[PDB]
Design an enzyme around this catalytic site. Structure first.
Site, PDB file in Angstrom:
ATOM      1  N   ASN A   5      -9.061   6.061   2.459  1.00  0.00           N
ATOM      2  CA  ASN A   5      -9.855   6.927   1.602  1.00  0.00           C
ATOM      3  C   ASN A   5     -10.545   7.983   2.458  1.00  0.00           C
ATOM      4  OD1 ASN A   5     -11.837   5.285   2.750  1.00  0.00           O
ATOM      5  ND2 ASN A   5     -13.120   5.257   0.920  1.00  0.00           N
ATOM      6  N   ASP A  18     -12.634   6.851  -7.113  1.00  0.00           N
ATOM      7  CA  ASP A  18     -13.896   7.001  -6.379  1.00  0.00           C
ATOM      8  C   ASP A  18     -14.100   8.458  -5.938  1.00  0.00           C
ATOM      9  OD1 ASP A  18     -11.724   6.355  -4.655  1.00  0.00           O
ATOM     10  OD2 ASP A  18     -13.068   5.718  -3.064  1.00  0.00           O
ATOM     11  N   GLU A  47       0.847  -1.204   0.000  1.00  0.00           N
ATOM     12  CA  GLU A  47       0.000   0.000   0.000  1.00  0.00           C
ATOM     13  C   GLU A  47       0.872   1.240   0.000  1.00  0.00           C
ATOM     14  OE1 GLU A  47      -2.901   0.343  -0.892  1.00  0.00           O
ATOM     15  OE2 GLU A  47      -4.482  -0.480   0.374  1.00  0.00           O
ATOM     16  N   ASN A  98      -7.870   7.760  -5.501  1.00  0.00           N
ATOM     17  CA  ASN A  98      -8.611   6.716  -6.182  1.00  0.00           C
ATOM     18  C   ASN A  98      -9.767   7.340  -6.932  1.00  0.00           C
ATOM     19  OD1 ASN A  98      -7.020   4.534  -5.324  1.00  0.00           O
ATOM     20  ND2 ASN A  98      -8.173   4.407  -3.387  1.00  0.00           N
ATOM     21  N   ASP A 133      -6.013   8.294  -1.256  1.00  0.00           N
ATOM     22  CA  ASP A 133      -5.568   7.359  -0.233  1.00  0.00           C
ATOM     23  C   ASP A 133      -4.431   8.010   0.515  1.00  0.00           C
ATOM     24  OD1 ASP A 133      -7.464   5.501  -0.801  1.00  0.00           O
ATOM     25  OD2 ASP A 133      -6.167   4.316  -2.128  1.00  0.00           O
ATOM     26  N   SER A 142     -11.988   9.773  -4.005  1.00  0.00           N
ATOM     27  CA  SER A 142     -11.239   9.830  -2.778  1.00  0.00           C
ATOM     28  C   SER A 142      -9.777   9.618  -3.057  1.00  0.00           C
ATOM     29  CB  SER A 142     -11.729   8.770  -1.798  1.00  0.00           C
ATOM     30  OG  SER A 142     -12.930   9.188  -1.197  1.00  0.00           O
TER      31      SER A 142
END
Length: 129
Positions: A59, A48, A35, A46, A52, A50
């Site tokens: 998120n 979405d 990660e 991301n 990270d 959001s």
């Protein structure tokens, strides 16, 4: 602060997650390599909408406050960016709880299939306890 191999493995037990709520020493270490690449500074947004944040790829949408993600619960209620500094002493507050949620470690995309069922006794290998 960019950590070494045996530079990231003792401070996790220093904060109490050892076999935490049924989650053992065998289940933590691999995931940060996947990660954050053992990095404290890996910020990625991301699709979405959001981003990270932190070494945990959090998120902003469900748990933190970044101000550009509306409709976010901001449940943790802290700078979504304090989740970024070398001093992680407060970030796991939300790590120990995002799991009581009950759907598990399945809040992260890699360890689930990139790190689960895999040889874990080996990440804790070559080091002192």
């Amino acid at each position: 602060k960019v950590f070494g191999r045996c530079e990231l493995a003792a401070a996790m037990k220093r904060h109490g997650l050892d076999n935490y709520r049924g989650y053992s020493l065998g289940n933590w270490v691999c995931a940060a390599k996947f990660e954050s690449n053992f990095n404290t500074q890996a910020t990625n947004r991301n699709t979405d909408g959001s981003t990270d944040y932190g070494i945990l790829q959090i998120n902003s949408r469900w748990w933190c406050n970044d101000g550009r993600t509306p409709g976010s619960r901001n449940l943790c209620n802290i700078p979504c960016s304090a989740l970024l500094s070398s001093d992680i002493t407060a970030s796991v507050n939300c790590a120990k709880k995002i799991v009581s949620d009950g759907n598990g470690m399945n809040a992260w995309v890699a360890w689930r299939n990139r790190c689960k069922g895999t040889d874990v006794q080996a990440w804790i290998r070559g080091c002192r306890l």
